[PDB]
Amino acid sequence: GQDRSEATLIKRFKGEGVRYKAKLIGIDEVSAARGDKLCQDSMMKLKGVVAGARSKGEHKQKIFLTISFGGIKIFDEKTGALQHHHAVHEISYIAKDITDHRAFGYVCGKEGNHRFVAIKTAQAAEPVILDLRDLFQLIYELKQREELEKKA
């Protein structure tokens, strides 16, 4: 039970935002901006690729992802370097992995350039998904009140 009041959420997502330890499953090109089946099919495909690489001795990249007013950022764990950056306006859909409580993904990109990014979280994926929901809702609300800049 975490506090999700507006004031708390602003302090939560400002600056570097919230960080989560995870592993990158992969990135797949998709045909649309949203869709439950679209995402589950992509997640299943990417995991299949990872499983095939895992049989060859390959492991997923260790990362940490942050959720902030800057959107979703993926950093390499070993070096701390920023590897992927998807702005809030570029993210269209968030989806939990129906078969894995520790995996989720999101669709990003403009029309005709959609990609599904799959993440295996160190702990439960739920808190990450809820943070994204809260972040997007907050930005929508602040924008409607013309106060996003005063809180970002």
Partner: peptide, 10 residues
């Protein structure tokens, strides 16, 4: 699962 209210298609 949910849609991002702030997503911009273009």
């Amino acid at each position: 699962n949910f849609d991002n209210p702030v997503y911009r298609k273009t």
